[PDB]
Design an enzyme around this catalytic site. Sequence first.
Site, PDB file in Angstrom:
ATOM      1  N   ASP A 136     -69.227  60.223 -41.527  1.00 20.98           N
ATOM      2  CA  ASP A 136     -70.271  60.654 -42.449  1.00 20.98           C
ATOM      3  C   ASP A 136     -69.644  61.234 -43.710  1.00 20.98           C
ATOM      4  O   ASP A 136     -68.671  61.993 -43.636  1.00 20.98           O
ATOM      5  CB  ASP A 136     -71.170  61.709 -41.802  1.00 20.98           C
ATOM      6  CG  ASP A 136     -71.796  61.237 -40.508  1.00 20.98           C
ATOM      7  OD1 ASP A 136     -71.823  60.014 -40.260  1.00 20.98           O
ATOM      8  OD2 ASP A 136     -72.240  62.103 -39.727  1.00 20.98           O
ATOM      9  N   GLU A 178     -76.698  69.520 -43.664  1.00 23.30           N
ATOM     10  CA  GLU A 178     -75.778  68.412 -43.445  1.00 23.30           C
ATOM     11  C   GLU A 178     -74.374  68.721 -43.948  1.00 23.30           C
ATOM     12  O   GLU A 178     -73.388  68.335 -43.312  1.00 23.30           O
ATOM     13  CB  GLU A 178     -76.289  67.142 -44.136  1.00 23.30           C
ATOM     14  CG  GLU A 178     -77.486  66.488 -43.461  1.00 23.30           C
ATOM     15  CD  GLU A 178     -77.123  65.819 -42.144  1.00 23.30           C
ATOM     16  OE1 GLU A 178     -75.914  65.662 -41.863  1.00 23.30           O
ATOM     17  OE2 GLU A 178     -78.051  65.455 -41.390  1.00 23.30           O
ATOM     18  N   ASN A 236     -73.559  57.666 -43.382  1.00 22.57           N
ATOM     19  CA  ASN A 236     -72.751  57.095 -42.316  1.00 22.57           C
ATOM     20  C   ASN A 236     -72.150  55.745 -42.710  1.00 22.57           C
ATOM     21  O   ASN A 236     -72.788  54.928 -43.383  1.00 22.57           O
ATOM     22  CB  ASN A 236     -73.609  56.949 -41.056  1.00 22.57           C
ATOM     23  CG  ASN A 236     -72.823  56.468 -39.879  1.00 22.57           C
ATOM     24  OD1 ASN A 236     -72.632  55.272 -39.708  1.00 22.57           O
ATOM     25  ND2 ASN A 236     -72.347  57.394 -39.061  1.00 22.57           N
ATOM     26  N   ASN A 295     -67.624  60.583 -36.343  1.00 29.99           N
ATOM     27  CA  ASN A 295     -68.532  60.442 -35.214  1.00 29.99           C
ATOM     28  C   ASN A 295     -67.812  59.813 -34.027  1.00 29.99           C
ATOM     29  O   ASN A 295     -66.742  59.211 -34.165  1.00 29.99           O
ATOM     30  CB  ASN A 295     -69.750  59.605 -35.598  1.00 29.99           C
ATOM     31  CG  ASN A 295     -70.467  60.156 -36.812  1.00 29.99           C
ATOM     32  OD1 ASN A 295     -70.872  61.318 -36.834  1.00 29.99           O
ATOM     33  ND2 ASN A 295     -70.608  59.330 -37.840  1.00 29.99           N
ATOM     34  N   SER A 314     -67.259  55.830 -36.579  1.00 31.94           N
ATOM     35  CA  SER A 314     -67.765  55.905 -37.940  1.00 31.94           C
ATOM     36  C   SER A 314     -67.614  57.328 -38.485  1.00 31.94           C
ATOM     37  O   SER A 314     -67.343  58.283 -37.751  1.00 31.94           O
ATOM     38  CB  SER A 314     -69.226  55.453 -38.005  1.00 31.94           C
ATOM     39  OG  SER A 314     -70.091  56.393 -37.395  1.00 31.94           O
ATOM     40  N   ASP A 362     -68.344  57.251 -32.255  1.00 34.03           N
ATOM     41  CA  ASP A 362     -68.187  55.802 -32.264  1.00 34.03           C
ATOM     42  C   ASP A 362     -67.149  55.323 -33.272  1.00 34.03           C
ATOM     43  O   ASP A 362     -66.993  54.111 -33.448  1.00 34.03           O
ATOM     44  CB  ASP A 362     -69.535  55.120 -32.547  1.00 34.03           C
ATOM     45  CG  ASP A 362     -70.124  55.498 -33.907  1.00 34.03           C
ATOM     46  OD1 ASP A 362     -69.489  56.251 -34.676  1.00 34.03           O
ATOM     47  OD2 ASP A 362     -71.230  55.016 -34.222  1.00 34.03           O
TER      48      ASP A 362
END
EC number: 3.2.1.17
Length: 129
Positions: free
Chosen positions: A52, A35, A59, A46, A50, A48
């Site tokens: 991380d 990750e 998230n 991301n 958002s 959309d």
Amino acid sequence: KVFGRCELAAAMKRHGLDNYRGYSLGNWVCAAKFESNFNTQATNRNTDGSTDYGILQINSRWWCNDGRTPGSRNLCNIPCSALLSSDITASVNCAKKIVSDGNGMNAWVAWRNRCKGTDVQAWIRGCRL
């Protein structure tokens, strides 16, 4: 801060992740590796809108507030920047909420695609736990 793999394993064990909800320590180390590459400052946007955050790439749509993800929840009741600390306590406790949500560690795309079904305990070999 960039962790060493044994240093991260020791820290995650201290905070009670070893076999938390049936997931041995090697699963958590393998997930962190893919990750974030063991980097607490890792951020990733991301599609959309958002973002991380942190060593487990948590998230902002559901788990933390970064002030720029509209119509989002803050289920871990923290600012997302707290997930970038070299102290991994907030990240670990939030991950404990996530893994208990129902999908287990399948909540982490990298873990499912790169750790699930492999020899995860290889990630803690040679470490002094």
